Amino acid sequence: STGSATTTPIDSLDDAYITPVQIGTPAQTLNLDFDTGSSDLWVFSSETTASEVDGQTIYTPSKSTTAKLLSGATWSISYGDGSSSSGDVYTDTVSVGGLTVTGQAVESAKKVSSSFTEDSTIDGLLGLAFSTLNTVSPTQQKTFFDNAKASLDSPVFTADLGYHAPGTYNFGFIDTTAYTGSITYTAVSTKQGFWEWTSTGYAVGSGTFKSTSIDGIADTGTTLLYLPATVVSAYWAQVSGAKSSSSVGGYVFPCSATLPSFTFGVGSARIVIPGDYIDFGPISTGSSSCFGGIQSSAGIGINIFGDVALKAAFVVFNGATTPTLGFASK
């Protein structure tokens, strides 16, 4: 089997992407944030505290003939941005882009933090990291991808995120028309539960490539590119007027400046992030100070190849017995 679903930016900055997912019988369609940096499929629901729901579409398990309480099971998650959610669990039929999993754990939110309430466009998350990070207790649950794997034509999914435009998540096949050149594959460590890999270096604009190992995660659920402070400083030093602002919480630059591209290494291959992808617009409405799309990872504890980086590539998440990551230009 295979599946193919379009993913769409939630706003004009590409802050996140939503993908429609069918849950239950008859189908209830929710728009979920596909997140290769976590491993829980959770949704706003009829059980979510009413005051914490503001415009989201909710899953109502009582209206699904295929929903079953996963008795005794609870979940609770916190994300890198300080947001969180928790609740109980149902199993139900879940389909993404034509690909159906029966018995998928659907984690129903009883509580969500303010960031989720305030984002009316995101009805929940669909985790695509390794199932070892799943938070369901007492019995850890498998991700949608892990459940689908044995039925898929090939044990892979791909992320083809758009710049200020829709893109695609495919399951079970590699669309050879969706990228240019070849796909370069690189080793993954699953020791932390992430799609963790090592970039071979970077270049700023037309500058010489610096060969240096950068360990990080491929995370579709993070907006920006977070790299070591040395790398990030070298980038912003090439932007007139750029500075790190502790009041704003990162590097800002005058909206009159031209942004250089940023290249990262995948083995001997190179992915070029165009300068425009690094512009996240005014820090506040009407400001001439713009927020940068490359920021320091210092104090996160991990480097994160988020959407800024991934949307510059066609990315293969290979869940074979020995997992790997593939990157192609497009």
Swiss-Prot record:
The active site is at 35, 199. GO terms for molecular function: aspartic-type endopeptidase activity. It catalyses: Hydrolysis of proteins with specificity similar to that of pepsin A, prefers hydrophobic residues at P1 and P1', but does not cleave 14-Ala-|-Leu-15 in the B chain of insulin or Z-Glu-Tyr. Clots milk. Disulfide bonds join 255-290. Its EC number is 3.4.23.22. One of its GO terms (biological process) is proteolysis. Belongs to the peptidase A1 family. This is Endothiapepsin. The chain holds residues 90 to 419 of 419 of the full protein.
